[PDB]
Design a protein around this ligand. Structure first.
Ligand code: CLA
Ligand code: CLA
Ligand code: CLA
Ligand code: CLA
Ligand code: CLA
Ligand code: CLA
Ligand code: CLA
Ligand SMILES: CCCCCCCCCCCCCCCC(=O)OC[C@H](COP(=O)(O)OC[C@@H](O)CO)OC(=O)CCCCCCCCCCCCCCC
Ligand SMILES: CC1=C(C#C/C(C)=C/C=C/C(C)=C/C=C/C=C(C)/C=C/C=C(C)/C=C/C2=C(C)CCCC2(C)C)C(C)(C)C[C@H](O)C1
Ligand SMILES: CC1=C(C#C/C(C)=C/C=C/C(C)=C/C=C/C=C(C)/C=C/C=C(C)/C=C/C2=C(C)CCCC2(C)C)C(C)(C)C[C@H](O)C1
Ligand SMILES: CC1=C(C/C=C(\C)CCC[C@H](C)CCC[C@H](C)CCCC(C)C)C(=O)c2ccccc2C1=O
Ligand code: SF4
Lengths: 78, 42, 741, 74, 179, 168
C-alpha cells in the first residue's frame, strides 16, 4: 500500500503552492469571464471574479491532493 | 362519474380486457370448485 | 443564461380526450373507416414528432413519458422487493446460500400448476428465480423481510412521486424549449449530481452498512445475531472492531492521510474466497473513486459563471483536411433533434449492456452469484439481448433523424454530408469484408464437417490438426495474469481469474477458473465478428440510403417507413430504413443467439463444474467444446441435442413450465413465417371471401376488415420470430441450467 | 394418437386445398385487382396502392400452398 | 439605523471600496461595506441575510446557553446527563435522547422556514429576510426598530465568534465559558 | 397576503377563509394541486374516525361488553381480527363507503359540501349561527382528536399501559 503522510508543514506548503499556481494559471487560461463584479484587486488581477477564484481553488485542491499523494508514493514528501 | 371517463371505460380494449378477465375468473373458479371434469356427469 | 422557465397550466387534466382515440393525430381523429385505423393508432401513439411541429410540445411529452417510465420501473422494483419479503425463501438462503435455491414466486393450485412449486429448499417450495435479487440484497446488507418490506414501501412511494411529477410537469408546470436545450447544464448535473452523488451515496452505504454486515456473514455469524445498520452507524467502536481505522475518524480524509483507510478501502482484486464474489471493500473504493471522477467531470461545461467549455466551440474546432468542416452543425443537430440523441444514447446503452454482461460473469460482483449458475447464464444472455435490441433501435432512430430532421442547408461539407457523399465506398467495402468473414469463418466449419465426414480428421482445423491459435487473446490473458505486482503493483490478485490463475471454489463448486482459448474459440470469435459486421452492414446501409439512392432518388419524401415504391425498377421491396432495421433485427437475433450459445457451452464445458477432493474439477459437459465445437454437427449433437434433454424431459417436474414454453416458443417462431413468407393480396382476397360469407347473413362490421399493411405484416412476422426464438432459447437455457445446477 | 394425427392430416389437406382453390378461383379477378386475367398467372404484384397487393397472383397461391403441402406431407 | 454607522457611506476596506451589489444599496441593515469576496453579487441578498440572521440567532442563543450552563444548572439535569460540560454535555444529552427530540422539533420549525424561503421564488413572497413576526412584547413597534435591527445583527456577529472561541477554549482547556 | 396562522408564510391562494377552521395553513401546497373540497372531505372523515376512536378507547378502558373478553383497546384489534368481528366492522364500513364514493363524485360535481352528509338526526344544527359555530367546533375537535388518537396508541405501545391507567 502506498504511503500517505500525516498533515505537516510540507503538505500545507504543497497545497498552498498548488492553489497559487492554479490561480495564476486560471488568470492566463480562463477564456470567458462571468458577468458580475470582481474581487478587490488591481493590475493583472483586475477581473478576478469569485467564480474564477472558486474554480482556480478547486483545481488547485485537485492538483495539491494529486501532488501530495504522488510525492508520498515516491517517498519525496514523506 | 365523468361521462368522458365512462366512454373511455366503454372503449373496445378496456371492455375486452374486463370481459375476458371476468370469463377467465369464471372458468378458474369453476375449475377450482369442480376440478378435473373431463366429462359431463351422467 | 441557464435558467428555469415554465408554462403554467398548459394542458387541462380531463378525460375528454380519453374517449377520443387518435386525438393526437389529424388523420386518425376522424375515425375508423377501416381496421387499419386501429393498427395506426398504436403504431403512431408515441410518434410525437408526427403529431405536431412544436419542439416544445414534443419535449414536454418526452419529459412526462420519462416520468411515467420511471414510475413503472419503481413499481417493478417495489414488486420484486415485496415478493422477496413475502413470497420468498430469503432467510433460509441467508442461512445456507449454497444449498437452497433462491425463490420469490409462488403459484396457486388451480389446474395442477402447483407442480411448479418445486422443492427449492429451506422448507419452501416455489418457482426458482434467476434474477440475482437475493445476492443483490445480501450485498446490500439486508438480513430480514422487514427491511425488504421497507424497500418495497420506498419503491412504491417513488413510483407515486414519479407519476405525480409526470402529471405536474405536463399539466401544471411544463418547462420550455429554452429549459430543455441546456446540454451543458444537463450534462454537468447528470455527471456530477446523478452519477457522482449516486456512487458517493452507494460508497457511503457500503462503508457503513454492507461492509460490516457482509464481514460478519462471511465470518459465519447468524443473520439474526448481526447488529443493525444504525447500530453500526452510531457505534463507531463496533465498526472500529471490524475495520480498525474508524477509530481514526475523518481527519485522515481531510489531511490526505488516506492510507489510514486501507482496511476498508483497498485494491485487493480477485474474488472473496468465502462468497466467490468481488470484495465489497474493493467495490466501496471503486464507487468512491468513481464519485470523485464524475464530480470532477461534471465541472467541464459553461452554465452561468464563465468557467467551462462550450461544446459548439469544441466541435467546430475539431476539423481536419480529410473532413472539411468537421463537426460543425452537430451541436445544433443534437439540440434540435430528439431522434439523433435517442440513437446515440441507445447505441451507447446497448454497448454498455453487452460490456456489463461480460464483466459481471468474469468478475462476479455479488456474494454467491458465481456458483448460482442459473443466475449467471440468465443475466449474461438477458443483457446481451437488451444490448442487441438497443443497438438496432439506435440504427432505427438514426434513420428516422436522417429522414425527418436532416437538413442539407445546415449540414454542408461537414462529417454527416461527407459520409452521405461517399456512402457507396463504405457499403461496398463493408460488403466485401462481410463476405470475406463469412467465408473464412463459416466455410472453416464446413471444411471441418466435410473432413470429419470423410475420415480425414488430420486435415481439419483443430488443436489436434491444422491449428488456428488465438495467440493475441492468449497474450492478453498472460498479461492480465502477470499484471498483479508488475503492471498493477499494488493489486494483490488479477482482475478476473478467467485470464488465468487459481480456481475459485465455493461450496465445492467452481466460481471462476481460467478460460482457455484454442482453435474452437478462434473460430467462434471470428464468427462473432462476421455476424456483428453483417448486422452493421444492414443497419448502416439503410441509414445511409434512407433519403436517396441510385434506385429511388426521392426516398425522404416517401418517408422513413414505407412499404415499397412499386414493382417498377425491377422491384423496390423493403427499400426503406425501416426495412433495414427489420432485416438487421433478424441478424441481431442471429448474432446474439450464437454469442449466448458460445457462452453456455464454453462455460459448461471448461469453467463450471464440481471440484473433487483431489482438487480436480469435473465440468458439466467435460471438455466437449474443444473437439466438438469445431463442427456444425458438433454443435447440433453435443450442444443442442445433448443439452435439450433437460427441457424435453421436464414434464411432471417443476420445470414442466419450461418444457411447455419451449413448445409454445417453437409454435410462435413457426407462426411468424406465415407473416414473413407471405403478402397482403392473398389475405385481402381471403378476407373478401369471408366478408361475403358475413354479408350473406345480412351483417358485417362498419369498420371494414382489411389485411395488415405490408409494413405491419413485416413487423408482426419479426415480432413473432424474435419472441419464438428467444423464448425457445429461454426455456432451453433455464431448464438445462436449473437441472444441472 | 392416430385419431389426432389423422385430424391434423385433415387440417393439412383442407388448408392446402383452401390456398389452391382460392388461387384458382380468384385467378381471373378479385375485388382488389378485378382485372387479373389481363396481367396473367405469375405477375409480381399490383403495387402499394389499394392497401398493398403483395402476393395477389395465382402463382403466389401455388407458392403458398407448396409450403403447406410440404407441411402436410411432413 | 444611522447612515453613518450602517449605510451607503460606510467602508470597511478603504483600499477596495463599497461593493456595487444589490446588498449594498444602503437599505439592508448591518451594512459596513464589507464583502471582499463579492459573495452578494452571486447569491441572493435575501438568502444571505436569512442565513446570517439564522446564524446570529443560533450562535447567540448557544453562547447565552453555555454561560447559563456554567453558572446555573437546572435541577435534575446535573444528575441525569452526567457532569460533562459543553460538547460532552451534547453527547450526554444525545444519549439521553434530549438532543434527538430537540432535533425533531427544530426540524419541524425549519420545514416551515424552508417553505418561507421557497416562497420568495415560487410565489414571489415579499417576506423580509429573517422576519417571522415574533415581536410579542412589542419593541419593533416604536422608533427603536432600526436600532434594534442593528443591535440584533451586531450582537449575533459578536456571538458567532464568541461561541467559536468558547468551544475551542473548551476543547483545549476542558473548561466551560466561565474560566 | 400572508397566512393568519403563520405570519411569515403567504396565504395559500385556494384557502380564502370560507371553510371552517381555515387559518391559512397549507405550507406544502396540497391545496394548490388537489381539490380543496376533496381534501376537506378527507379531513372530516379522518377527524370523525379519530374522535370516535378516542371515545372508543376511553369507553373500552372503563367498560367492555359482558360477552367480550376484557382487554386493552389496542389488543382488541388483533383479537377481533381472528374472532371475526373486525371483519364485520370492516365490511359494514366498506358498505357505507360504497355510497361514500357516490357522495364524493357528487362533491366533485359540486352538488354537495365536503363533509356534509345531511346527518342531523336530533336537529341540533337548525339555526345558522349555531351551525357555523358547530362547524368550527367540529373541525377543531376533529384535528385535536386526530392528534390525540395517535398519542393514545403510541403511548400504549411504549408503556403497554392504557391511558387512564397511565395518567396516574
Ligand atoms: C509532482 C507531482 C506528482 C507525482 C510525483 C505523482 C506521482 C504519481 N501519481 Mg500523480 N498526480 C499529480 C501529480 C503527481 N503525481 C497531479 C497534480 C494529479 C492531479 C491531476 C495527479 C493525479 C493522479 C491520479 C489520478 C493518479 C496518480 C497516480 C500517481 C502514481 C502512480 C501513477 C503511475 O505510475 O501510473 C502508471 C499507469 C499506467 C501507465 C497505466 C494507465 C492506464 C489507465 C489505467 C487507463 C487509461 C487509458 C485511456 C482510457 C485510453 C488511452 C488514451 C487513448 C486516447 C489512446 C505516481 C507515483 C496514480 C496512483 O496513485 O496510483 C496508485 C493515480 O491513480 N496521480
Ligand atoms: C410490478 C410487478 C409485479 C408483478 C409482475 C407481480 C406478479 C404477481 N403478484 Mg404482485 N405485487 C406487486 C408487483 C408485481 N406483482 C407489488 C408492487 C405488490 C405490493 C402491493 C404486489 C403484491 C402482491 C401480493 C400481495 C400478491 C401478489 C401476487 C402476485 C402473483 C399473482 C398475481 C395475480 O394473479 O393477480 C391477478 C389479479 C387480478 C385482478 C387479475 C404474480 C406472480 C400474489 C401471489 O404471489 O400469490 C401467491 C399475491 O398474493 N403480488
Ligand atoms: C454520502 C455518503 C456518506 C454519508 C452520508 C456518511 C455519513 C457519515 N460518515 Mg462517512 N464516509 C463516506 C461516505 C459517507 N459518510 C465515505 C465514502 C467514506 C470513505 C472516505 C467515509 C468514511 C467515514 C469514516 C472513516 C467515518 C465516517 C463517519 C461518518 C458519520 C459522521 C460524518 C456519518 C454517519 C464517522 C462515523 O461515525 O462512522 C461510523 C467516521 O468515523 N465516514
Ligand atoms: C429508449 C427507447 C426507445 C424509445 C424512447 C423509442 C421511441 C420511439 N420508437 Mg422505438 N425503438 C427502440 C427503442 C426506443 N424507441 C428500440 C430498442 C428499437 C429496436 C427494436 C426501436 C425500433 C423502432 C422502430 C423501427 C420504430 C420505432 C419508432 C418509435 C417511435 C414510435 C413508437 C411507438 O409508437 O410505439 C408504440 C408502441 C407500440 C407500437 C408497441 C410495440 C410493442 C410490440 C408489439 C412488441 C411487444 C412485446 C412485449 C415485450 C411482450 C412480449 C411477450 C408476449 C407473450 C406478449 C418513438 C419515437 C417508430 C417511428 O419513429 O416511426 C416513425 C418506428 O418505426 N422504434
Ligand atoms: C440554543 C442553544 C442551546 C443548546 C444547544 C442547549 C443545550 C442544552 N442546555 Mg441549554 N440553554 C440555552 C440554550 C441552549 N441550551 C439558553 C439560551 C439558556 C439560557 C436561558 C440555557 C440554559 C441552560 C441551563 C441553565 C441548563 C441548560 C442545559 C442544557 C442541556 C439540557 C437541555 C436543557 O436544560 O434545556 C443541553 C445540552 C442543562 C445542563 O447544562 O445540564 C447539565 C441546564 O441545566 N441550558
Ligand atoms: C434537560 C433535561 C432534563 C432532565 C433529564 C431532567 C430530569 C429531572 N428533573 Mg428536571 N428540569 C429540567 C430539565 C430536565 N430535568 C429543566 C429545563 C428545568 C427547569 C425548569 C427542570 C427543573 C426541575 C426541578 C425544579 C426538579 C427537576 C427534577 C427532575 C427529576 C424528575 C423529573 C422532573 O421533574 O422533570 C429528573 C431527574 C426534580 C429533582 O430534583 O429530581 C432529582 C426537581 O425537583 N427538574
Ligand atoms: C471574542 C472571542 C474570543 C476571545 C475573547 C478569546 C480569548 C482568548 N483566546 Mg481565543 N479564540 C477565538 C475567539 C476568542 N478568543 C476563536 C473564534 C477561536 C477559534 C479559532 C479561538 C481559538 C483559540 C485557541 C485555539 C486558543 C485561544 C486562546 C485564547 C486566549 C489568548 C488569545 C489567543 O487567541 O491565544 C484568550 C483567553 C488560547 C488559550 O489559552 O485558550 C484557552 C488558545 O490556545 N483562542
Ligand atoms: C479506427 C481505425 C482507423 C483507421 C484509420 C482512419 C483514420 O484514422 O483517419 C482519420 C482521418 C482524420 O481526419 P481529419 O484529421 O480530417 O479529421 C479529424 C476529425 O477530428 C475532424 O473530423 O479521417 C479520415 O480520413 C477518415 C477516413 C476513414 C478511413 C476509412 C478506412 C477505415 C475504415 C474502417 C476499417 C478499419 C479497419 C482497420 C483495421
Ligand atoms: C457540539 C459538538 C462539537 C462541537 C461544536 C461546536 C459548537 C463547534 C463550533 C465551532 C465554531 C462556532 C467555530 C467558530 C470559528 C470562528 C472563527 C474561526 C472566526 C474567525 C474570524 C475571523 C478570522 C475574522 C476576521 C476579520 C473579520 C471577518 C472581521 C473583523 C476583522 C477580522 C476579525 C480580522 C464537537 C465538534 C466538539 C464534537 C462534539 O461531539 C459535538
Ligand atoms: C399499526 C396498527 C394499529 C394502528 C393504528 C393507528 C390507528 C395508528 C395511528 C397513528 C396516528 C394517528 C399517528 C398520529 C400522529 C400525529 C402527529 C405526529 C401529529 C403531529 C402534530 C403536530 C406536530 C402539530 C403541530 C401544531 C401545528 C402544525 C400547528 C399548530 C401548532 C402546533 C402545535 C405546532 C392498530 C392500533 C390497529 C394495531 C395494529 O397492530 C396495527
Ligand atoms: C396471416 C396474415 C394476415 C391476416 C391476419 C390478420 C388480418 C390479423 C388479424 C388478427 C386479429 C384481428 C387480432 C386479434 C386476435 C389475436 C388472436 C389476438 C392477438 C393480437 C393482439 C395482441 C394485438 C395478413 O393480413 C397479412 C398481411 C400482410 C402480410 C402478411 C399477412 C399474414 O400473414
Ligand atoms: S408490393 Fe409487395 S411486392 Fe410489390 S413491391 Fe411492394 S413489397 Fe414488393
Amino acid at each position: 500500500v502506498p504511503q500517505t503522510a500525516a498533515w505537516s508543514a510540507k503538505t500545507c506548503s504543497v497545497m498552498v503552492i498548488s492553489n497559487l499556481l492554479c490561480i495564476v494559471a486560471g488568470r492566463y487560461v480562463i477564456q470567458v469571464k462571468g458577468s458580475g463584479p470582481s474581487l478587490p484587486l488591481t493590475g493583472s488581477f483586475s477581473n478576478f471574479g469569485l467564480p474564477e477564484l472558486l474554480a482556480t481553488t478547486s483545481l488547485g485542491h485537485i492538483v495539491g491532493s494529486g501532488a501530495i499523494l504522488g510525492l508520498s508514493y515516491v517517498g519525496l514528501l514523506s | 362519474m365523468d361521462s368522458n371517463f365512462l366512454k373511455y371505460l366503454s372503449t373496445a380494449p378496456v371492455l375486452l380486457t374486463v370481459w375476458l378477465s371476468f370469463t377467465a375468473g369464471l372458468v378458474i373458479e369453476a375449475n377450482r370448485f369442480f376440478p378435473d371434469m373431463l366429462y359431463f356427469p351422467m | 443564461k441557464v435558467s428555469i422557465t415554465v408554462d403554467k397550466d398548459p394542458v387541462a387534466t380531463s378525460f375528454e380526450k380519453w374517449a377520443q382515440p387518435g386525438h393526437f393525430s389529424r388523420t386518425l381523429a376522424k375515425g375508423p373507416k377501416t381496421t387499419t385505423w386501429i393498427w395506426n393508432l398504436h403504431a403512431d401513439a408515441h410518434d410525437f414528432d408526427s403529431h405536431t411541429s412544436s419542439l416544445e410540445d414534443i419535449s414536454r411529452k418526452i419529459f412526462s413519458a420519462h416520468f411515467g417510465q420511471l414510475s413503472i420501473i419503481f413499481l417493478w422494483l417495489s414488486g420484486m422487493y415485496f415478493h422477496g419479503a413475502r413470497f420468498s425463501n430469503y432467510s433460509a438462503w441467508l442461512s445456507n446460500p449454497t444449498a437452497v435455491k433462491p425463490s420469490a414466486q409462488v403459484v396457486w393450485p388451480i389446474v395442477g400448476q402447483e407442480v411448479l412449486n418445486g422443492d427449492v429448499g429451506g422448507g419452501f417450495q416455489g418457482v426458482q428465480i434467476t434474477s440475482g435479487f437475493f445476492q443483490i440484497w445480501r450485498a446490500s446488507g439486508i438480513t430480514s423481510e422487514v427491511e425488504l418490506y421497507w424497500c418495497a414501501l420506498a419503491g412504491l412511494l417513488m413510483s407515486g412521486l414519479m407519476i405525480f411529477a409526470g402529471w405536474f410537469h405536463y399539466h401544471k408546470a411544463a418547462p420550455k424549449l429554452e429549459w430543455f436545450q441546456n446540454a451543458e447544464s444537463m450534462l454537468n448535473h447528470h455527471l456530477s449530481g446523478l452519477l457522482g452523488l449516486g456512487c458517493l451515496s452507494w460508497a457511503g452505504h457500503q462503508i457503513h452498512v454492507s461492509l460490516p454486515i457482509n464481514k460478519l456473514l462471511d465470518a459465519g455469524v447468524a443473520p439474526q445475531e448481526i447488529p443493525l445498520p444504525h447500530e453500526f452507524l452510531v457505534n463507531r467502536d463496533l465498526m472500529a472492531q471490524l475495520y480498525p481505522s474508524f477509530s481514526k475518524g475523518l481527519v485522515p480524509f481531510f489531511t490526505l492521510n488516506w492510507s489510514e483507510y486501507s482496511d476498508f478501502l483497498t485494491f485487493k482484486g480477485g474474488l472473496n474466497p468465502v462468497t466467490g464474489g468481488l470484495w465489497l471493500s474493493d467495490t466501496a473504493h471503486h464507487h468512491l473513486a468513481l464519485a470523485v471522477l464524475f464530480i470532477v467531470a461534471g465541472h467541464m461545461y459553461r452554465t452561468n459563471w464563465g468557467i467551462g467549455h462550450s461544446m459548439k466551440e469544441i466541435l467546430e474546432a475539431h476539423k481536419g483536411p480529410f473532413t472539411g468542416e468537421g463537426h460543425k452543425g452537430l451541436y445544433e443537430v443534437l439540440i434540435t433533434s430528439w431522434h439523433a440523441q435517442l440513437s446515440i444514447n441507445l447505441a451507447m446503452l446497448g454497448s454498455l449492456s453487452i460490456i456489463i454482461a461480460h464483466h459481471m460473469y468474469a468478475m462476479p460482483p455479488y456474494p454467491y452469484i458465481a456458483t448460482d449458475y442459473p443466475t449467471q447464464l440468465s443475466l449474461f444472455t438477458h443483457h446481451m439481448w437488451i444490448g442487441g435490441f438497443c443497438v438496432c433501435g439506435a440504427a432505427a432512430h438514426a434513420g428516422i433523424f436522417m429522414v425527418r430532421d436532416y437538413n442539407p442547408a445546415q449540414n454542408y461539407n461537414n462529417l454527416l454530408d461527407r459520409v452521405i457523399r461517399h456512402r457507396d465506398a463504405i457499403i461496398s467495402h463493408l460488403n466485401w469484408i462481410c463476405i470475406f468473414l463469412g467465408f473464412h469463418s463459416f466455410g472453416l466449419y464446413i471444411h471441418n464437417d466435410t473432413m470429419r465426414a470423410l475420415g480425414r480428421t488430420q486435415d481439419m482445423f483443430s488443436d489436434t490438426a491444422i491449428q488456428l491459435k488465438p495467440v493475441f487473446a492468449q497474450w492478453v490473458q498472460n498479461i492480465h495474469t502477470v499484471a498483479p505486482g508488475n503492471t498493477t503493483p499494488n493489486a494483490l490478485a488479477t482482475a478476473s481469474y478467467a485470464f488465468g490463475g487459481n480456481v475459485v471454489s465455493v461450496g465445492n463448486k467452481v466460481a471462476m477458473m481460467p478460460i482457455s482459448l484454442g482453435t474452437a474459440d478462434f473460430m467462434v470469435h471470428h464468427i462473432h465478428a462476421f455476424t456483428i459486421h453483417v448486422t452493421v452492414l444492414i443497419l448502416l446501409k439503410g441509414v445511409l440510403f434512407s433519403r436517396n439512392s441510385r434506385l429511388i432518388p426521392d426516398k425522404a419524401n416517401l418517408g422513413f417507413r414505407f412499404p415499397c415504391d412499386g414493382p417498377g425498377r425491377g422491384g423496390t421491396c423493403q427499400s426503406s430504413a425501416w426495412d433495414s432495421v427489420f432485416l438487421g433485427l433478424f441478424w441481431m437475433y442471429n448474432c446474439i443467439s450464437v454469442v449466448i450459445f458460445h457462452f453456455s457451452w464454453k462455460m459448461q464445458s471448461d469453467v463450471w463444474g464440481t471440484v473433487q477432493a483431489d482438487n480436480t474439477v469435473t465440468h458439466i459437459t467435460g471438455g466437449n467444446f474443444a473437439q466438438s465445437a469445431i463442427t456444425i454437427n458438433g454443435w447440433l449433437r453435443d450442444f443442442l441435442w445433448a443439452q435439450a434433454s433437460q427441457v424435453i424431459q421436464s414434464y411432471g417436474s417443476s420445470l414442466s413450465a419450461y418444457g411447455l414454453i419451449f413448445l409454445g416458443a417453437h409454435f410462435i417462431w413457426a407462426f411468424s413465417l406465415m407473416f414473413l413468407f407471405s403478402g397482403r393480396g392473398y389475405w385481402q382476397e381471403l378476407i373478401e371471401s369471408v366478408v361475403w360469407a358475413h354479408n350473406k347473413l345480412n351483417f358485417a362490421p362498419a369498420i371494414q376488415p382489411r389485411a395488415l399493411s405490408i409494413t405491419q405484416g413485416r413487423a408482426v412476422g419479426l415480432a413473432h420470430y424474435l419472441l419464438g426464438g428467444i423464448g425457445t432459447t429461454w426455456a432451453f437455457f433455464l431448464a438445462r441450467i436449473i437441472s444441472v445446477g | 394418437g392416430d385419431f389426432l394425427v389423422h385430424h391434423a392430416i385433415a387440417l393439412g389437406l383442407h388448408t392446402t386445398a383452401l390456398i389452391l382453390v382460392k388461387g384458382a378461383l380468384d385467378a381471373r379477378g378479385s375485388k382488389l385487382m378485378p382485372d387479373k386475367k389481363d396481367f396473367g398467372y405469375s405477375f409480381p404484384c399490383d403495387g402499394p396502392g389499394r392497401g398493398g397487393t403483395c402476393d395477389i397472383s395465382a402463382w403466389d397461391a401455388f407458392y403458398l400452398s407448396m409450403f403447406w403441402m410440404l407441411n402436410t406431407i411432413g | 439605523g444611522a447612515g453613518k454607522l450602517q449605510g451607503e457611506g460606510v467602508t470597511a476596506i478603504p483600499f477596495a471600496g463599497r461593493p456595487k451589489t444589490p446588498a449594498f444599496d444602503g437599505t439592508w441593515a448591518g451594512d459596513t461595506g464589507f464583502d471582499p469576496l463579492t459573495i452578494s453579487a452571486w447569491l441572493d441578498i435575501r438568502f444571505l441575510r436569512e442565513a446570517e440572521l439564522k446564524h446570529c440567532r443560533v450562535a447567540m442563543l448557544a453562547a447565552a446557553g453555555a454561560i447559563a450552563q456554567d453558572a446555573f444548572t437546572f435541577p435534575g439535569t446535573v444528575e441525569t446527563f452526567g457532569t460533562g460540560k459543553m460538547t460532552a454535555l451534547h453527547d450526554a444529552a444525545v444519549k439521553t435522547g434530549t438532543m434527538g427530540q430537540m432535533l425533531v422539533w427544530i426540524g419541524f420549525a425549519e420545514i416551515f422556514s424552508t417553505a418561507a424561503i421557497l416562497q420568495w421564488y415560487t410565489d414571489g413572497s415579499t417576506r423580509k429576510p429573517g422576519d417571522f413576526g415574533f415581536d410579542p412584547l412589542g419593541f419593533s413597534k416604536g422608533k427603536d426598530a432600526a436600532r434594534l435591527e442593528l443591535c440584533e445583527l451586531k450582537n449575533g456577529r459578536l456571538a458567532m465568534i464568541a461561541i467559536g472561541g468558547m468551544i475551542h477554549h473548551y476543547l483545549i482547556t476542558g473548561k466551560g465559558p466561565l474560566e | 397576503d400572508f397566512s393568519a396562522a403563520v405570519p411569515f408564510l403567504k396565504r395559500p391562494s385556494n384557502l380564502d377563509g370560507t371553510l371552517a377552521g381555515d387559518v391559512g395553513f397549507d405550507p406544502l401546497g396540497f391545496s394548490d394541486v388537489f381539490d380543496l373540497r376533496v381534501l376537506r372531505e378527507a379531513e372530516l372523515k379522518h377527524g370523525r374516525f379519530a374522535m370516535l376512536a378516542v371515545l372508543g378507547f376511553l369507553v373500552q378502558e372503563v367498560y367492555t361488553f359482558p360477552f367480550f373478553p376484557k382487554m386493552a383497546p389496542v389488543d382488541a384489534h388483533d383479537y377481533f381480527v381472528t374472532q371475526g368481528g373486525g371483519s364485520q366492522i370492516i365490511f359494514w364500513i366498506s358498505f357505507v363507503e360504497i355510497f361514500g364514493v357516490v357522495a364524493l363524485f357528487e362533491l366533485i360535481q359540486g352538488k354537495r359540501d365536503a363533509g356534509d352528509f345531511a346527518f342531523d338526526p336530533l336537529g341540533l344544527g337548525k339555526d345558522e349561527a349555531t351551525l357555523a359555530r358547530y362547524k368550527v367546533a367540529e373541525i377543531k375537535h376533529a384535528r385535536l382528536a386526530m392528534i390525540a388518537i395517535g398519542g393514545f396508541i403510541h403511548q400504549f405501545w411504549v408503556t403497554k399501559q392504557t391511558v387512564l391507567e397511565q395518567l396516574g
